[PDB]
Structures are given as structure tokens and as C-alpha cells.
Write an enzyme that holds these catalytic residues in place. Structure first.
Site, PDB file in Angstrom:
ATOM      1  N   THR A 128      -1.060  -7.143  -0.739  1.00  0.00           N
ATOM      2  CA  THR A 128      -2.197  -7.666  -1.497  1.00  0.00           C
ATOM      3  C   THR A 128      -2.060  -7.358  -2.987  1.00  0.00           C
ATOM      4  O   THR A 128      -1.688  -6.252  -3.355  1.00  0.00           O
ATOM      5  CB  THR A 128      -3.517  -7.102  -0.975  1.00  0.00           C
TER       6      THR A 128
HETATM    7  C1  LIG Z   1      -1.958  -3.043   4.112  1.00  0.00           C
HETATM    8  C2  LIG Z   1      -0.843  -3.644   3.777  1.00  0.00           C
HETATM    9  S1  LIG Z   1      -0.771  -4.411   2.153  1.00  0.00           S
HETATM   10  O1  LIG Z   1      -2.105  -4.051   1.408  1.00  0.00           O
HETATM   11  O2  LIG Z   1      -0.285  -5.912   2.204  1.00  0.00           O
HETATM   12  N1  LIG Z   1       0.550  -3.530   1.489  1.00  0.00           N
HETATM   13  C3  LIG Z   1       0.273  -2.422   0.546  1.00  0.00           C
HETATM   14  C4  LIG Z   1       1.106  -2.627  -0.714  1.00  0.00           C
HETATM   15  N2  LIG Z   1       2.497  -2.961  -0.392  1.00  0.00           N
HETATM   16  C5  LIG Z   1       3.410  -2.880  -1.535  1.00  0.00           C
HETATM   17  C6  LIG Z   1       3.118  -1.725  -2.475  1.00  0.00           C
HETATM   18  C7  LIG Z   1       3.148  -0.402  -2.045  1.00  0.00           C
HETATM   19  C8  LIG Z   1       2.877   0.627  -2.924  1.00  0.00           C
HETATM   20  C9  LIG Z   1       2.592   0.336  -4.240  1.00  0.00           C
HETATM   21  O3  LIG Z   1       2.332   1.367  -5.167  1.00  0.00           O
HETATM   22  C10 LIG Z   1       3.343   2.094  -5.733  1.00  0.00           C
HETATM   23  F1  LIG Z   1       3.951   2.932  -4.882  1.00  0.00           F
HETATM   24  F2  LIG Z   1       2.881   2.884  -6.721  1.00  0.00           F
HETATM   25  F3  LIG Z   1       4.261   1.280  -6.249  1.00  0.00           F
HETATM   26  C11 LIG Z   1       2.572  -0.973  -4.674  1.00  0.00           C
HETATM   27  F4  LIG Z   1       2.292  -1.274  -5.962  1.00  0.00           F
HETATM   28  C12 LIG Z   1       2.833  -1.995  -3.800  1.00  0.00           C
HETATM   29  C13 LIG Z   1       2.704  -4.106   0.507  1.00  0.00           C
HETATM   30  C14 LIG Z   1       4.175  -4.408   0.784  1.00  0.00           C
HETATM   31  O4  LIG Z   1       4.214  -5.089   2.060  1.00  0.00           O
HETATM   32  C15 LIG Z   1       5.497  -5.588   2.488  1.00  0.00           C
HETATM   33  C16 LIG Z   1       5.973  -6.592   1.532  1.00  0.00           C
HETATM   34  C17 LIG Z   1       6.380  -7.405   0.763  1.00  0.00           C
HETATM   35  C18 LIG Z   1       1.949  -3.890   1.823  1.00  0.00           C
END
Ligand SMILES: */C=C/S(=O)(=O)N1CCN(Cc2ccc(OC(F)(F)F)c(F)c2)[C@@H](COCC#C)C1
Ligand SMILES: */C=C\S(=O)(=O)N1CCN(Cc2ccc(OC(F)(F)F)c(F)c2)[C@@H](COCC#C)C1
Ligand SMILES: [Cl-]
Ligand SMILES: [Cl-]
Ligand code: NA
Ligand code: NA
Lengths: 320, 309
Positions: free
Chosen positions: B1
Site C-alpha cells: 500500500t
Molecule cells: C500488509 C501488507 S502491505 O501493506 O501491502 N505491505 C507493507 C509494505 N510493503 C513494502 C514496504 C515495507 C517496509 C517499508 O518501510 C521501510 F522499511 F522503511 F522501507 C516500506 F516503505 C515498504 C509491501 C511489500 O509487499 C510485497 C511487494 C511488492 C507489503
């Protein structure tokens, strides 16, 4: 759009709504009957709100979505004077919403019930609408005779600008297996003919819900049995006889909420299933046993068929 | 998202959200990014609320649906202490909602006139981490930041909350944007790419504002950039459903008109937010549709010349 709200002998409430949506709508258009907070709401009594409250909407279009009306009514009904709270909501948060400002006329309605223990149960039930007319039926397991009524705007009122509001109060023995149901067959233009048919489907829907309650059913199963009856009438814009969309096809929205668990099920743009409310209720039921709460289109149809919900392959469309 | 919130030089706000939804979801499952009140919210100042407010959510599942979180945050932000209001909401109406562990987050901004414009912006999350970026048209350098839960915190039980303040000259063609690339598990690697996509997203939104664009077109330009990153669960690279196909949810709200556009379970379209924005734009002109799903949404998108894939 058809709807029902139920309370069982313990004060557990449920609500459901089902609709065919706007006539000649673009394929895939989803309206309020599928949308969380908008089409219906059910919430048992808790620390923050002393009444169990259930709400289902009538009318169609985007007016009921933009104001999230069913939830809004449920929250207002936590005030002491239920009649005043609903009237204020209809006037201020519906007709005069800024979300409908450039709209000339706001057309819709609600059925409501709220209960509290005093071991007996006090049930207040109301309907309200800005349409010319609305057909309701209501019944308690003790009175054993469904009452039906066609609510009309009074002379001098202006459809889409005035509010009609009526209701009653019912005291139940919260000892046996009783309860109360209020349903509606639609809110819209008055029709002198078929007025009897709308009243009779409301009578039959109430009886089905009351019979479910008298057999020990959950409030969600009783409100679903009322909606199946309402859907099945060829005269209601829901289930059988739904308005055809732009391509001449049927696409149904339906949803249901359980006051005790606060769980919710909904389908949108569903074709090929006789009773859309049955799929929404099964989604709610499976969630009780992260499960889906809202399915649309082809996926909702395939899910319904895989759960043994009676289908219509000839009435199902899958464009590609 | 992914999500973005924008305020233009006049104090008009807009918000948008886009998502691939749950991995391996049943076909046709629609989550919060498509649902009015839940995924995003934008509302200019009015009689009942003195701040113009924009909210976009992060995370997936049904926790954000059940509490109608974006609108709930918007209404809470009418209190004086914006930081306290958002924290109370995340704790009381999110973690402790009557509706074991809830994972999600929000980005928010609120503005008011003082001719000067005061913009308060915050993000909050119960996930391990969240990547945000923000930019004003005056500073001309996007800032990106990885918000993490503090040591000892437990995802789904603790809340992180940060924010800032931005003053704009309400005379020119400026504005402010805040974006997020997702809230979820921390990733030391590809963190640079999450910051980089947030940077590009902010610059696109600011460029639109500086060309006189509407806040909705600017927030749309931010989300198109976020969608196109293979690392975000939205648009390109979306989680595949149970049958191995992509089905996208997206929505957008305009604070000035309060109109809304949304798509759910949309397949075959490169940028779902472009469709939601186009539904909103056509509504501005019988009540036109604001929420389309499935094959019907695809056919409408292609009939309006929105590129397919
Ligand atoms: C519940 C699942 S989601 O909300 O679709 N989802 C969470 C975010 N993902 C990418 C992501 C992870 C962590 C972040 O923060 C950081 F570590 F600081 F970078 C970020 F910015 C983004 C999604 C990835 O899903 C698989 C794909 C493509 C999942
Ligand atoms: C937006 C339109 S709708 O809400 O789907 N809809 C309004 C209700 N229609 C049937 C109806 C009309 C009037 C009623 O009350 C009265 F007059 F007292 F009988 C009533 F109970 C129901 C509905 C039917 O549309 C075509 C069909 C089927 C349209
Ligand atoms: Cl339409
Ligand atoms: Cl699923
Ligand atoms: Na019918
Ligand atoms: Na992406």
C-alpha cells in the site's frame, strides 16, 4: 434497495441491505448496499454506547455513500431521544450535508431499531425517508401478526428536501426466544398499484425473520431470511428483478453486519446468484470461525458457487 | 500500500491511496484502499472543522476498514494538539478498537490560514517501519525518512509517531506533499530504493503544483510514481492473488469539492490511481459513478484512454 434490522431476545442486533443499484449503470458500478458503514450498521451495547443499534438504508445512488449514513444514524442513536436524534441526522447530515451541496435534492431513507434492557428488552424502531414514499413492515415474536405500513411525505413536503419520520416502541420479554424485526421494500416514488404487493412482501419477510428467531437462530440468520424474501419479490430492485445495467445485465450489491461480533460481509457487482444477501451472510459466517469480508465480480461469484450457494450460470456474465 | 497527501498554495487539500492487497487473496477481494472513508480522506476547512485535512492509510488487512480509519483520523485532527490527537486515535480507535495485534499506519496533514498557510504533517504506524517523503515547493529538496519502532517495541502493539511543521506563502503557486511507500517489516536493503521512490514521488507532485495543477492531479502524479516502483505493493509489483493475478484497489478524494473516485479488484491497468482520479474528474462535470470494480472498471479505463498492460 431492500433492508431489514433484527433484535433477538438478548439484545443482539443485526442489519442487512441488498440492491440492484441504478438502472443503466456502467458495469462494475458499486453503490451503498455493498459499502461498510454506508448501507447498513449493527452494533451491540458496549462501554462507549449504551444501546444496541441496527440500521439499514433505502434509496440508491451516491447520496448514502458520501454521508456514510447508516453508521452516522447508529452513532446519533446513542443520544437519549432517538426520534430527535434520527430527525437531526436526516436533516443535518443527510439533506444538508456539504458532501451533497451541488446536488439538487437528496433521496434516501433508513430503518432503525435500538434496544436496551431495563429481565426485559425495550425496543424503539423508526423509519425515515426523503423520498415520496417508503414501505415498511414490522413484527415482534409476541404480537404474532406482522404490521405493514406505507410511509408518505405529507402535503406541502418536497421530495428530496423534506423528511418524514415515524416509529414506535415495543417491550419484549427477554426470557423466552422472542425478538423484533423491521424491514423495508424500498423508498422512492409512490405507486398506488403494487402498493399491496410491497406490503405483502414486507409481511412475509417479517414472518420469516420471526420464525427463524423462534427456532433459535442467530440475529444474522434471521435478518438474512427476511432479506431473501424481499430480494425474491419481482417488484423490488434487489435479487430477482434488479434494474439492468448499461449492458442489460444484473449486478447486485448486498451486505450484512452482526452487532455482537461487529463482523461484516458484503458483495458488490455480483451476477448469477439468486440471493446476494446469502453470499454476504456466508462471508460473515465464515469470518466468525484473515478471512475476506468484501468480494466483488467474478471472484464473488466463484466464491459463492464453491460454498454451495444456489447459482445461475445462465445469469452469470464473465467478460474478458 | 502506498499513499500521498497534498495541500496547494490556497489550502485546498487532496489525498490518495493505492494497493495490491493481501498476497494470495481470493480473487475479487477488495480492501481498504478502495473504500470510501477507510483508505484516504480529504476535507477542506468548513463550519464543523477548522482545519483543512488530508489522510492516507498504509498496511493491509481489514483493521483499517473496520474502524473507517482515514475519516476517523481526519475528524480527530480537529483538536488543538494534532500529535496527541493522532496518537490517541492510533491507540484508542485503532489498537484498542472494539472492532491480537493490528498492523497499519497513516500519513496526515492539516492546514489553516493565518496571507500565510500553516501546514502540520504527521505519520504514524504500528508496523516495524514506514518510509515517507515530503517536500514543499519553496525548499526545493525532497526529504525522505524511514520511521522505525523504537527498541523494545512490539509491532502491532506499540505506536510510532513523528511529524513536522511547514509554513507556506499562500500567494504563489506552491504547496506541500507528504507520501509513503508502505508500512510493514523493516528492510535494511531496498530501503534506499523506498526513499528514492518517495523522493521522485514528491518531486512529481510539486512539479504539478508549480504548473498550476489541481491538488488532485498533483497527488495523482505522486501515486503514479509510487505505483511504478517494483518494490511497492501497488500498481506494478502488486502482491499476486490466489490465482497468480494482480488485482488493485485505489482511491482519491478532493478536499475542496469533497468528490471521490475509486477502483477495486482492477486488473490489466498500469496505474490504478489514474483511473480513480479520472472517475473523480468526470464527476466534477444523473449522478456519475465514483466506485467501479473488476472487468467493468477495466473497460471504463480503456474507454477513457488510460494505458493498459
Ligand atoms: C500488509 C501488507 S502491505 O501493506 O501491502 N505491505 C507493507 C509494505 N510493503 C513494502 C514496504 C515495507 C517496509 C517499508 O518501510 C521501510 F522499511 F522503511 F522501507 C516500506 F516503505 C515498504 C509491501 C511489500 O509487499 C510485497 C511487494 C511488492 C507489503
Ligand atoms: C434509486 C432507486 S431504488 O432505491 O433501487 N428504488 C426505490 C424503490 N423502488 C421500489 C419501491 C417504490 C415505492 C415503494 O413504496 C411504496 F410506494 F409505498 F410502495 C416501495 F416500497 C418500493 C425501486 C424499484 O425499482 C424497480 C424495481 C424493481 C427503485
Ligand atoms: Cl454509472
Ligand atoms: Cl481472501
Ligand atoms: Na427483487
Ligand atoms: Na508498485
Amino acid at each position: 434497495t431492500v433492508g431489514a434490522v433484527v433484535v433477538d431476545h438478548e439484545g443482539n442486533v443485526a442489519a442487512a441491505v441488498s440492491s440492484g443499484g441504478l438502472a443503466l449503470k456502467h458495469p462494475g458500478r458499486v453503490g451503498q448496499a455493498a459499502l461498510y458503514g454506508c448501507g447498513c450498521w449493527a452494533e451491540n451495547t458496549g462501554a462507549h454506547n449504551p444501546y444496541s443499534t441496527a440500521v439499514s438504508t433505502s434509496g440508491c445512488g451516491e447520496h448514502l455513500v458520501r454521508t456514510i449514513l447508516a453508521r452516522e444514524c447508529s452513532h446519533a442513536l446513542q443520544a437519549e431521544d432517538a426520534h430527535q436524534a434520527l430527525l437531526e441526522t436526516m436533516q443535518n447530515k443527510f439533506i444538508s450535508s456539504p458532501f451533497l451541496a451541488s446536488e439538487d435534492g437528496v433521496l434516501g431513507g433508513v430503518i432503525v431499531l435500538r434496544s436496551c434492557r431495563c429481565q426485559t428488552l425495550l425496543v424503539e424502531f423508526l423509519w425515515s425517508h426523503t423520498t415520496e414514499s417508503m414501505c415498511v413492515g414490522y413484527m415482534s415474536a409476541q404480537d404474532g401478526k406482522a404490521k405493514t405500513h406505507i410511509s408518505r411525505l405529507p402535503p406541502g413536503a418536497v421530495a428530496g428536501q423534506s423528511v418524514a419520520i415515524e416509529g414506535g416502541v415495543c417491550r419484549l420479554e427477554g426470557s423466552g426466544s422472542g425478538g423484533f424485526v423491521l424491514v423495508h421494500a424500498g423508498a422512492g416514488y409512490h405507486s398506488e398499484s403494487k402498493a399491496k404487493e410491497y406490503k405483502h412482501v414486507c409481511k412475509r419477510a417479517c414472518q420469516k425473520a420471526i420464525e427463524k428467531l423462534q427456532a433459535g437462530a442467530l440475529a444474522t440468520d434471521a435478518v438474512t431470511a427476511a432479506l431473501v424474501e424481499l430480494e425474491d419479490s419481482p417488484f423490488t430492485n434487489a435479487g430477482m428483478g434488479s434494474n439492468l445495467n448499461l449492458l442489460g445485465e444484473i449486478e447486485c450489491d448486498a451486505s450484512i453486519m452482526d452487532g455482537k461480533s461487529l463482523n461484516f460481509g458484503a458483495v458488490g457487482a455480483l451476477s448469477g446468484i439468486k440471493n446476494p444477501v446469502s453470499v454476504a451472510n456466508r462471508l460473515l459466517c465464515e469470518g466468525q470461525k484473515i478471512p475476506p469480508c468484501f468480494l466483488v465480480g467474478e471472484g464473488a461469484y466463484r466464491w459463492a458457487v464453491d460454498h454451495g450457494i444456489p447459482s445461475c450460470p445462465l445469469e452469470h456474465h464473465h467478460h474478458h
